[PDB]
Amino acid sequence: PDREKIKLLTQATSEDGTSASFQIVEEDHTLGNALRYVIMKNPDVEFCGYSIPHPSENLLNIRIQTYGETTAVDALQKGLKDLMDLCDVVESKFTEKIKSM
Amino acid sequence: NTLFDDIFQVSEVDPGRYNKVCRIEAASTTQDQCKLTLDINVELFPVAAQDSLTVTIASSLNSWRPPQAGDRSLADDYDYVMYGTAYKFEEVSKDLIAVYYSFGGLLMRLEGNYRNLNNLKQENAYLLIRR
Amino acid sequence: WNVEKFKKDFEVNISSLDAREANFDLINIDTSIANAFRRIMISEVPSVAAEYVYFFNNTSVIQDEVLAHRIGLVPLKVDPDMLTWVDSNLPDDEKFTDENTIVLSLNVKCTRNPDAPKGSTDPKELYNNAHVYARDLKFEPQGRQSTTFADCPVVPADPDILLAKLRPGQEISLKAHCILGIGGDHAKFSPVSTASYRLLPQINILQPIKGESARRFQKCFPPGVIGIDEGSDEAYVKDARKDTVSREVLRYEEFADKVKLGRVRNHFIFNVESAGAMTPEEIFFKSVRILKNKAEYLKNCPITQ
Amino acid sequence: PQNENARAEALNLANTDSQYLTPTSGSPVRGLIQDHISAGVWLTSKDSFFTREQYQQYIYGCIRPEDGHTTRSKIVTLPPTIFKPYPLWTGKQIITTVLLNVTPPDMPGINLISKNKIKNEYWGKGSLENEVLFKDGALLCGILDKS
Amino acid sequence: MIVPVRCFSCGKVVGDKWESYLNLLQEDELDEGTALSRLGLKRYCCRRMILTHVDLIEKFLRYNPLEKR
Ligand SMILES: [Zn+2]
Known part of the structure; x- marks a missing residue:
């Protein structure tokens, strides 16, 4: 596997898991902004934002809080999946337009 | 429950130095002594002089979260709704009183007869406006 | 949504x-x-670009590191899919393979031209090989590459890039290793x-x-x-x-x-x-x-x- | 410093946070400058509005709740100022939200009546934006400034 | 000293364009802005690179320690 990529920051994650903070290595605004955009479309998410501690440490912090239907880890996964699917839609659309051009 | 309503007629709509907010001055059509001053995001709710606005202050609507499947509340009856705080009351004369509201900085000053504004307290309140 | x-x-x-x-x-x-x-x-x-430049001689007016730098800016017409990434934890011998690396050579000496039309300003007719262009980077295939790249030799995308200038007696002699990299690392x-x-x-x-x-x-x-x-x-x-x-x-x-x-x-x-x-x-x-x-x-x- | 006594002293006596006021006259020496003042005049302007998405993002980008300021282990937000036609928060709410997440929860919000450097005339007729009002920890009126 | 290879801001190759740019000014007798356009330099980023280049190298080259003057 690779365990060093994403980790939970257990000092800002609640007991019920409806709220959590993740630290992702080797990622900046590129993925961070895109991921929070997607996550915030999830109707059970009550809060979400990302931040970059410092421009010199390659680290990305994501915060997710839910209204209690799913856990914070769920929202992260739906967001990641949603993001993947969203790219597919773009790739396919672009392909068709190149063909039809 | 509802604390105050009246139909007001707008005198002035001043954009000041902003371009999304305007200061509105308007007088009641029902009370000769009741007048109003209100900052409005006029990009979301355009207002011109001589408009007639119905203005309601209510304590609740019958904590905040994006609208869901089939949510219904007092907001449905109006065009423009703001949430804010009463922060100052003042005696204007032996007969009349003014209350001051802030909606995240957009200020309202409502002056009127002390019996006409009896229900207003120094709490939070919703503001509802429709054309 | x-x-x-x-x-x-x-x-x-x-x-x-x-x-x-x-x-x-x-x-x-x-x-x-x-x-x-x-x-x-x-x-x-x-993308593929020159990363390591190995000089054997450079008696031109342009300093090694600067020459190396410009060679690195030359866009190579290479399909990056045709290459695998280098592992930068191995020693130099193991580091560079036929799946890893592309080798370019450059070998020019400038001599004076006897047949120069007397009273000439143009360095093409005054000197032989005064001007060195990107197109002068020769692609030297290694191992399996003679086969793999036989259908698409390695050529700079902009052949007429001016790389260096020389005068009689000066020579440049270098090999460059070109590998995969990304803009975030170096432009x-x-x-x-x-x-x-x-x-x-x-x-x-x-x-x-x-x-x-x-x-x-x-x-x-x-x-x-x-x-x-x-x-x-x-x-x-x-x-x-x-x-x-x-x-x-x-x-x-x-x-x-x-x-x-x-x-x-x-x-x-x-x-x-x-x-x-x-x-x-x-x-x-x-x-x-x-x-x-x-x-x-x-x-x-x-x-x- | 090379031993715990010296550690304790550098963290509790000579530490930067212990030295907000100067001993000369007892006035502040630490504050923000340049970009941050210009930014404040803009962010706290009446013309400043933010969607749910933006509001939440400004909050988290500056709170750093994964710190020693676990005043809560959940970020608190306000309801929007404009509910309808579209949910919008004001800049002044970003400030109130910040204070709300970093001041002690078992303790009432700050109360301040102050002034800033910009005269009311600069905003337009009837403005009160020169007056800085904090009630129960909420910025209800005025912009924030070098002052 | 010598033509830069890429435009500092664009990233666009510019080093293949010096010798031709001179020939445009010289032979075709164009003005500078017309010639720059003809070489495909659209952004002012890129026009700046060729417009203001100083081929100082041609001075350096006149001192060649490896030939009998
Ligand atoms: Zn350019």
Whole structure:
């Protein structure tokens, strides 16, 4: 596997898991902004934002809080999946337009 | 429950130095002594002089979260709704009183007869406006 | 929102596609994602460039490190898919393989020309090999590459790049190792002579404007942006897509009252130029794919407590 | 410093946070400058509005709740100022939200009536934006400034 | 000293364009802005690179320690 990529920051994650903070290595605004955009479309998410501690440490912090239907880890996964699917839609659309051009 | 309503007629709509907010001055059509001053995001709710606005202050609507499947509340009856705080009351004369509201900085000053504004307290309140 | 709702509303328009540059619109996509593609195209789409330069001699007027630098800026016409990445934890012997690396050589000596037309200024006729060009980088295939690259020799995308100049007696002699890298690391690896976008201009007129005002108003925007309609004689917007947003209108007092200038917030006009190795569309595809893998690689990593 | 006594002293006596006021006259020496003042005049302007998405993002980008300021282990937000036609928060709410997440929860919000450097005339007729009002920890009126 | 390879801001190759640009000014007798356009330099980023280049190298080259003057 690779365990060093994403980790939970257990000092800002609640007991019920409806709220959590993740630290992702080797990622900046590129993925961070895109991921929070997607996550915030999830109707059970009550809060979400990302931040970059410092421009010199390659680290990305994501915060997710839910209204209690799913856990914070769920929202992260739906967001990641949603993001993947969203790219597919773009790739396919672009392909068709190149063909039809 | 509802604390105050009246139909007001707008005198002035001043954009000041902003371009999304305007200061509105308007007088009641029902009370000769009741007048109003209100900052409005006029990009979301355009207002011109001589408009007639119905203005309601209510304590609740019958904590905040994006609208869901089939949510219904007092907001449905109006065009423009703001949430804010009463922060100052003042005696204007032996007969009349003014209350001051802030909606995240957009200020309202409502002056009127002390019996006409009896229900207003120094709490939070919703503001509802429709054309 | 919902991924299907997005699919139904998302749209692509391809204004112009070419071997070097693409002009196309992404419509109804969020700025965060357009921005992602843009960033990725510039900084994370791999390319091949010279990384290590091995000098055996350089008695030209240009210093080694500087010469090495320019060679690194030369865009090599190489398909990055044809190469694997170098592992930078192995010693130099193990580090560079036929799947890893491409070798270029350069070997020029400058001599004086006897047959120079007396009283000449041109260094082509005064000196032999005075000028050294990128095209002078010879591709030396190693191992399996004689086969793999037999159908596509390694050539700089811009042959006529001036690399160095010499005078009689001076020589350059070097081998360069060229590998995969990304723009975020060093800009020599960026596969674009630039990818950027603009939001589609929105010129909305706040009341009809006609007659001599129409003609006046029309001239505050580039040719073709504002049309004057026959009949109503009033001005209307032909295509905002041609507008440069100079805000010229807002200077003339008579108009500043009657026009708001905005954007269609979710409509991105992309322009992508390739440095020469891959086509624009490939570079854009590769970026849309790169973003997706980030999301996929992350979904599959275990979250350590 | 090379031993715990010196550690304790550098963290509790000579530490930067212990030295907000100067001993000369007892006035502040630490504050923000340049970009940050200009930014404040803009962010706290009446013309400043933010969608749910933006509001939440400004909050998290500056709070750093994964710190020693676990005043809560959940970020608190306000309801929007404009409910309808579209949910919008004001800049002044970003400030109130910040204070709300970093001041002690078992303790009432700050109360301040102050002034800033910009005269009311600069905003337009009837403005009160020169007056800085904090009630129960909420910025209800005025912009924030070098002052 | 010698033509830069890429435009500092664009990334666009510019180093293949010096010798031709001179030939445009010289032979075709164009002005500078017309010639820059003909070589494909559109952004002012890129026009600046060729417009204001000083081929100082041609001075350095006149001192060659490896030939009998
Ligand atoms: Zn340039």
